[PDB]
Amino acid sequence: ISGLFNFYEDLYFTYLEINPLVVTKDGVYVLDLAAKVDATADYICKVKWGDIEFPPPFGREAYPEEAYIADLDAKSGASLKLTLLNPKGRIW
Amino acid sequence: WARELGLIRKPASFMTSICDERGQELIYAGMPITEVFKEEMGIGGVLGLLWFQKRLPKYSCQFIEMCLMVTADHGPAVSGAHNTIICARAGKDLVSSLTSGLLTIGDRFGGALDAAAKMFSKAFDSGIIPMEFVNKMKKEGKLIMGIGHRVKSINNPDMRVQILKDYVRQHFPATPLLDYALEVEKITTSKKPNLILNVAGLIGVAFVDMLRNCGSFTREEADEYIDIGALNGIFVLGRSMGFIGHYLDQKRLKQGLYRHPWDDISYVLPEHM
Amino acid sequence: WARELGLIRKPASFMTSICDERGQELIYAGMPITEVFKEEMGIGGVLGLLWFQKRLPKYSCQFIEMCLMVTADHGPAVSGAHNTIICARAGKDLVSSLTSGLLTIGDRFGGALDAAAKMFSKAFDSGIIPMEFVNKMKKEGKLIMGIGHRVKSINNPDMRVQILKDYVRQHFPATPLLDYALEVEKITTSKKPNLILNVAGLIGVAFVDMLRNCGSFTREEADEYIDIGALNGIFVLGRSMGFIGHYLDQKRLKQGLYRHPWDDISYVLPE
Amino acid sequence: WARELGLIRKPASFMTSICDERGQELIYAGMPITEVFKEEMGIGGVLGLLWFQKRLPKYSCQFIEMCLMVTADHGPAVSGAHNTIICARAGKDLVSSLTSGLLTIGDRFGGALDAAAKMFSKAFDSGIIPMEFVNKMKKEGKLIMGIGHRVKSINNPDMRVQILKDYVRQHFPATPLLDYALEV
Amino acid sequence: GKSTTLFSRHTKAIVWGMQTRAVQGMLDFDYVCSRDEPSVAAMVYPFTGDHKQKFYWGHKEILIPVFKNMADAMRKHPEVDVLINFASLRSAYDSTMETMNYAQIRTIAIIAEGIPEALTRKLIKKADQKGVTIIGPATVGGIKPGCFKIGNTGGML
Numbered sequence A: 001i002s003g004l005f006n007f008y009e010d011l012y013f014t015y016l017e018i019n020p021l022v023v024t025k026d027g028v029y030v031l032d033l034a035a036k037v038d039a040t041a042d043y044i045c046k047v048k049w050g051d052i053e054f055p056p057p058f059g060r061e062a063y064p065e066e067a068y069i070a071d072l073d074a075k076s077g078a079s080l081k082l083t084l085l086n087p088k089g090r091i092w
Numbered sequence B: 001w002a003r004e005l006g007l008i009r010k011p012a013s014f015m016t017s018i019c020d021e022r023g024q025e026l027i028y029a030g031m032p033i034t035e036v037f038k039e040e041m042g043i044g045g046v047l048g049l050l051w052f053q054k055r056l057p058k059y060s061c062q063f064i065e066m067c068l069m070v071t072a073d074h075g076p077a078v079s080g081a082h083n084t085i086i087c088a089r090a091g092k093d094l095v096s097s098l099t100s101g102l103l104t105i106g107d108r109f110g111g112a113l114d115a116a117a118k119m120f121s122k123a124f125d126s127g128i129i130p131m132e133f134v135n136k137m138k139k140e141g142k143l144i145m146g147i148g149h150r151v152k153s154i155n156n157p158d159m160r161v162q163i164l165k166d167y168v169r170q171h172f173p174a175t176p177l178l179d180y181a182l183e184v185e186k187i188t189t190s191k192k193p194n195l196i197l198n199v200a201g202l203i204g205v206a207f208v209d210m211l212r213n214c215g216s217f218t219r220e221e222a223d224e225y226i227d228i229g230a231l232n233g234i235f236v237l238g239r240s241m242g243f244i245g246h247y248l249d250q251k252r253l254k255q256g257l258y259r260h261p262w263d264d265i266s267y268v269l270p271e272h273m
Numbered sequence C: 001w002a003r004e005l006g007l008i009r010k011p012a013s014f015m016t017s018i019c020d021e022r023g024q025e026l027i028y029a030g031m032p033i034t035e036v037f038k039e040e041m042g043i044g045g046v047l048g049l050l051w052f053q054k055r056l057p058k059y060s061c062q063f064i065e066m067c068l069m070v071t072a073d074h075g076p077a078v079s080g081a082h083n084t085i086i087c088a089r090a091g092k093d094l095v096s097s098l099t100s101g102l103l104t105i106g107d108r109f110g111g112a113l114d115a116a117a118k119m120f121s122k123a124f125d126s127g128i129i130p131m132e133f134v135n136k137m138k139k140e141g142k143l144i145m146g147i148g149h150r151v152k153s154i155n156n157p158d159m160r161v162q163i164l165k166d167y168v169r170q171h172f173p174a175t176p177l178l179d180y181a182l183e184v185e186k187i188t189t190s191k192k193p194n195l196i197l198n199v200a201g202l203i204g205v206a207f208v209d210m211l212r213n214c215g216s217f218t219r220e221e222a223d224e225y226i227d228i229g230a231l232n233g234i235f236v237l238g239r240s241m242g243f244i245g246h247y248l249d250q251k252r253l254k255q256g257l258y259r260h261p262w263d264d265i266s267y268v269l270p271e
Numbered sequence D: 001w002a003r004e005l006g007l008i009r010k011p012a013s014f015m016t017s018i019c020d021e022r023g024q025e026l027i028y029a030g031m032p033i034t035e036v037f038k039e040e041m042g043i044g045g046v047l048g049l050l051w052f053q054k055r056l057p058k059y060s061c062q063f064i065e066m067c068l069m070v071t072a073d074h075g076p077a078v079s080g081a082h083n084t085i086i087c088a089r090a091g092k093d094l095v096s097s098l099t100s101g102l103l104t105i106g107d108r109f110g111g112a113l114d115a116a117a118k119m120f121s122k123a124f125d126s127g128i129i130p131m132e133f134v135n136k137m138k139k140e141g142k143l144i145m146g147i148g149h150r151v152k153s154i155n156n157p158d159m160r161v162q163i164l165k166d167y168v169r170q171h172f173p174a175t176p177l178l179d180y181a182l183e184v
Numbered sequence E: 001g002k003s004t005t006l007f008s009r010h011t012k013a014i015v016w017g018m019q020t021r022a023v024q025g026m027l028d029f030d031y032v033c034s035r036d037e038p039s040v041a042a043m044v045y046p047f048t049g050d051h052k053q054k055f056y057w058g059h060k061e062i063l064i065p066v067f068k069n070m071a072d073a074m075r076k077h078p079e080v081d082v083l084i085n086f087a088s089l090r091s092a093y094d095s096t097m098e099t100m101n102y103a104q105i106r107t108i109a110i111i112a113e114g115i116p117e118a119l120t121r122k123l124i125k126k127a128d129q130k131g132v133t134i135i136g137p138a139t140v141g142g143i144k145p146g147c148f149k150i151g152n153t154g155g156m157l
């Protein structure tokens, strides 16, 4: 637990849960790693994260054109967000 | 007559190594002028002969000429162009106006090439990585010379920088200092997009790379040429063309004598001295 | 804010025509720097854009570059090189030494190109024949600027003169003033053999021929550029190369502060 | 006329404090030119007004004028005089020749006044005694700037130094740094 | 471990201090002695940076290096075996000790006038320990015709 909490602290996580965890004379077995991490802290853990990936939430896959806005989100400090549910609607 | 018979000994007060004009044919650092011209070595080659006493490779001479081209002029608002224009509008000759403009060249104006080269060379010669260099510069309270632009950034690159970068990449054999500078540049652009490698910074690092990697120089000679102010000379020679152009343009336009408006000057004098 | 809204009038006190740096692109006389580089307009083309605001033909740019190279340096004995060397040995920076050297460029040193161009243009434009021009200069007590060498007379021509003259004869469309200068040269070499066309005189006359016959100029424009001192700028830009070379050289040699010997000075003070 | 109404702010790009010519009388650092001449402030007084914005005492102005007189010329062999002579013999005008001579003034020629002042001031501001200053200069391989003449020694005084030092001792209120330099 | 032969036609020396006339007289003596190469390899002068002082070998101008520090002259010239010490009475002791810290020097000439006797005794002690021959202070030096001349002995040419 002390090692896991040190890993929590120095990797700047926010949400770290194991379900289930197996403890045995052989060792420790982690089966699920429910984890949410501070994206904005990427500038500190550039080396410590390598090429970190942020999976999209459950639902429809990200649009090829919405992902372009997602890419431009990090170009400058200005915030540029877009999200789609059903392009068929009239109100935009 | 006594010197001709060699019966009197007098020391020579001057020593020169760049040009010999005593003989039949003019010589540029041990090379006759006709041999200069028959080898298609132009402004860059002549500059290499006169400044370094070396026959630089063709790509080195072309890069020197390109550097002279990009630094030729940058508008009339800068200090040197402003001084040249004011001297020209005062009715002075070409030499006086050019000189008035050139004498502003130094630390704040015209010294970014030399300062950028010195800073990047000191960083690279030390074992520090680009991130350590950026952190050290931030801690020291000094901005990195050769980084940052008015409006250009990533996804909007400086065109002079791109032209020079494309040539140096495709022609220079090895550019470790340029790669170091580009890593520093990507760090700084992650910090803020406009913090791109300047024309001054790229010219400085690529000139150091040219001196250190063209094969015509030792490490000590390249370091000495950086220390003496070869990049100051590069900027001065490049910007002389633009200053002379400004002088000629002011003479053509027949601009009258200039006097600064009083409303633009803040007069704060002692009450009664 | 008022200027942005466009409700305030203040006239501009300065006018420029050679370079625009405000926009997204650096522009030399209405030409983007990218187009300058992709069309292979080198030092000569940039010089033509910045000084004359014209796109000169390729041979004009190469001739300008050759003129810059032939006037790059002429040894350390000349006045400007002497002053640059002395300022460099005094520990001053590059700009100060170059400036000390350049400030001697004028009537007696450096201005031979411009004087030769003016003299030959004035003679040719007046319609007088070369013999009449030579006689007129002789009666006025004036040496023909651009005529005279120290060692090279005949069968040993000045090699810089030969290179420039060969290029001009092979690439220029028409060289009337150059032919006039060669006529004058034949007369003066029949006078005594070392009175050949100098590099200064040939550069002046060939620059006038380029500026009058390349097709990018009118007669008024070419005359105005000659009168303003474009050839003075050509010589200054060429010799700045040699002066900076002399500065770097004196810095390499680590030469100490110079002091003129007292035996070379004639002290004639009143008493 | 928008600026007259006070409808527009435009910051002044230049700041000056030495001379005002906008008014009906020329002003030198707050002092009118007629008052400058009435008070018999010489070249030294005008120099004090223009360089320091101060009304210097009369002995200070006269000492400044004496310093100008002493440094007026030192022959044609020095670098600056040589460059001025070369440029003059090249047919250039007064400004170009004077400028060519002046641009040699720097660390090796003409910088001895400033170097000597800085060196002696840094020694005197620290607590070191003159002997400690001499030994400290010797240790670092630095010659004491402001000491050493080619031909003049003691019992053969330099006359320019003698005149200036006599005036300074006679008229100045206190000369601590001069005392330190004389011990050195 | 003092040596019987102190000077020869191949002896090269380092002069401490700027003594241009003495070095030039040494070179003139060398040239009239049909010596192959000059006997002054380098000069040491603490008060200026490294440079090259121009002297005369016969009728041709040559460059002799001048070093701010003695260590640079010692490193760049391993062939030097003599040091003519032209330091004053206040600097002869330290310069001579620093020279004796280098084993390539077999002979030291001290020209200074008025060295304190205790400092001279310390110099003699260290020279005896190091086996270095000292041409004692308050001297013009010595002369070996055809081989080597110390400073100003024998006047000018």
Ligand SMILES: CC(C)(COP(=O)(O)OP(=O)(O)OC[C@H]1O[C@@H](n2cnc3c(N)ncnc32)[C@H](O)[C@@H]1OP(=O)(O)O)[C@@H](O)C(=O)NCCC(=O)NCCS
Pocket: C259, C260, C261, C262, C263, D077, D112, D143, D144, D145, D146, D147, D148, D149, D150, D151
């Ligand atoms: C000032 C300082 C250079 C004087 O030392 P110095 O080298 O003995 O003095 P000089 O350089 O004038 O002497 C060189 C010799 O050449 C002579 N000489 C000087 N100028 C000459 C010239 N233009 N032509 C021919 N001979 C000249 C001198 O008379 C002197 O001859 P000497 O053998 O009769 O003494 C030295 O003490 C020093 O460096 N001090 C530091 C402080 C300083 O620089 N002050 C500024 C001085 S205003």
